[PDB]
């Protein structure tokens, strides 16, 4: 219905909104991970800084999505925002496990989406999601998984040394 | 429970995972006004840009409470995010209104939660609300208040012209 | 028949000098509509000036489209270049409703290049069309349907005033 | 008595002049803590500078409360500061035991002294303590707590190393 509409579907239009939803409660997630490493009996400031930071990305991610869908005149819809998985996030290691989980289930719905731009003809949105969002991901889910092994490494004996010689050494 | 806490009541530190949920509520708000006006039959810049500020704030706000309960050593607690109350607001005069009843709604909240401290002599509760919010909301509120004020008195005749020269003038 | 040339379909290399054509025909579009706007009894050198930076654009967009001709081993030809549809183009109002078909215009011709190129497995037009022309035309269409906005918003009443504002306030 | 006192009663001067007492008497503490850390037998450099920059800052502390005195027209009344409640400190978890423990004192000082003022009616007293003591109480208590959080964790097993990268990673 926009005067500007061309080539954009409305199942298209519909995911784009799922996905921004899902980058916004990702968003939330993080904001509670990096919260629950700055408790006083928790106290590991460079997860919290991770976390924190990871906020902020899917935050902006969120945000890149509305543009866009306000350039191909689509209407944002904004729907409620689910709470995060977990009020308690454990250790670094299950928090990391935790979030690499969280990025290929958002990994997951970006090549969801691609894959319905491709079968709908709409290359803009193929383009906008590679150049954006599908490498972001890659890189960012192999981050983790090396973060993860390094976490592993240093738990297996003197889980408490280890947490914190990788929160010192590797994310501070 | 915690080693540290003293003096940090089960009510207020309920009120403050309450209010961490209004704040947030409110910056969602305030994203989805952002975006609104931002649409191609929309079209407000300025307004976008006002509104898309005003979001990043409500989130700060959020993140300072979440610090604050826990340097008291209380627990942050999320729950879900409601929707905001529209998915389309109408003129800059139905959208500035709706946001001053937001901020009065966010004030009510602060005089509320400064009351029970009060109640529960919290004086690091007042001081923490008088320094970084209350003050913040009454300039807030009257800046809007004025904001609302050129609104009315531009669109009582020639309403499409009054808004664009709101915008290009006071907001942009 | 190039030495060079690789995966380079003779039915892309003819649709790449279509393309080429329709850009230099926009370009040459603009180029009129920019003068228009220049005519003393017409006065409006923002909107002169946004369609002279819109000649241009359009321009380079056809030596970018040759560039990459050549460099895919395939041989330009140009033909003759219509003028443009009017020869007075109305309001500002007018004028950018028709800047907006001819961008459609342009978009679809660069929408169906793209099939064409997926159509014969050609992933360096894919991505060159992508990379170069595909977002640019996005981001163009929604700037173009913000000012049409902008534009109806003004001239409902007092359409002489209307123009002037958005000519000093918004082009200029 | 003095031609510049007004609102501000007996019950506060002598109070003013206790936390005084207690903030001298932490800042001796404090010295002693960090003198300890620097026994040859003891070795921890870091850990010594904490106790001692804490020393300044209790001093300090004492100083602004004097001044506060003189401002508002009481006397300053010394008494003899009561040697601290150890000679020797133990092991780095001890010490930030002890340290928190002094601390928490402090901090319940504040607010009793806070609750006087309110009761007196005395709000220069109440903005004072709130603006220069509860926030920054409230800070160091924090601090202090993720110190022992990450202390615990470190020697758990392995008490020695754990000291010396504590001491070397967070302290120095
Ligand atoms: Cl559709
Ligand atoms: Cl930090
Ligand atoms: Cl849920
Ligand atoms: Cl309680
Ligand atoms: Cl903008
Ligand atoms: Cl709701
Ligand atoms: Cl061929
Ligand atoms: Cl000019
Ligand atoms: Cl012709
Ligand atoms: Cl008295
Ligand atoms: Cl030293
Ligand atoms: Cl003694
Ligand atoms: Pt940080
Ligand atoms: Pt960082
Ligand atoms: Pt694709
Ligand atoms: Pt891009
Ligand atoms: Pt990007
Ligand atoms: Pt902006
Ligand atoms: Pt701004
Ligand atoms: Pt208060
Ligand atoms: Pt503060
Ligand atoms: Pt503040
Ligand atoms: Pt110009
Ligand atoms: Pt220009
Ligand atoms: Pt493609
Ligand atoms: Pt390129
Ligand atoms: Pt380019
Ligand atoms: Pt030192
Ligand atoms: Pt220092
Ligand atoms: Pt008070
Ligand atoms: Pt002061
Ligand atoms: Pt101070």
């Known amino acids: 219905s926009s005067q500007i509409r061309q080539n954009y579907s409305t199942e298209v239009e519909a995911a784009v909104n799922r996905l921004v939803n899902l980058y916004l409660r990702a968003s939330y997630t ?7 490493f700055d408790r006083d009996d928790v106290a590991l400031e460079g997860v919290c800084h991770f976390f924190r930071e990871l906020a902020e990305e899917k935050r902006e991610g969120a945000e890149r999505l509305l543009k866009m869908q306000n350039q191909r005149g689509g209407r944002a819809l904004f729907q409620d925002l689910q709470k995060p998985s977990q009020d308690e ?24 989406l691609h894959a319905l731009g491709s079968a709908q003809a709409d290359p803009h949105l193929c383009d906008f999601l590679e150049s954006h969002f599908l490498d972001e991901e890659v890189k960012l889910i192999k981050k983790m998984g090396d973060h993860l092994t390094n976490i592993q490494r240093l738990v297996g004996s003197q889980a408490g040394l280890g ?3 990788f929160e010192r050494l590797t994310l501070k």
């Not at 993080?30 to 629950?36: D, I, K």
């Not at 454990?90 to 970006?110: C, F, H, P, R, Y």
């Open 30 to 36: 993080y904001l509670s991970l990096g919260f629950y």
């Open 89 to 112: 996030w454990g250790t670094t290691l299950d928090a990391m496990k935790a979030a690499i989980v969280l990025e290929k289930s958002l990994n997951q719905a970006l090549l969801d």
């Open 163 to 165: 947490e914190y010689l």
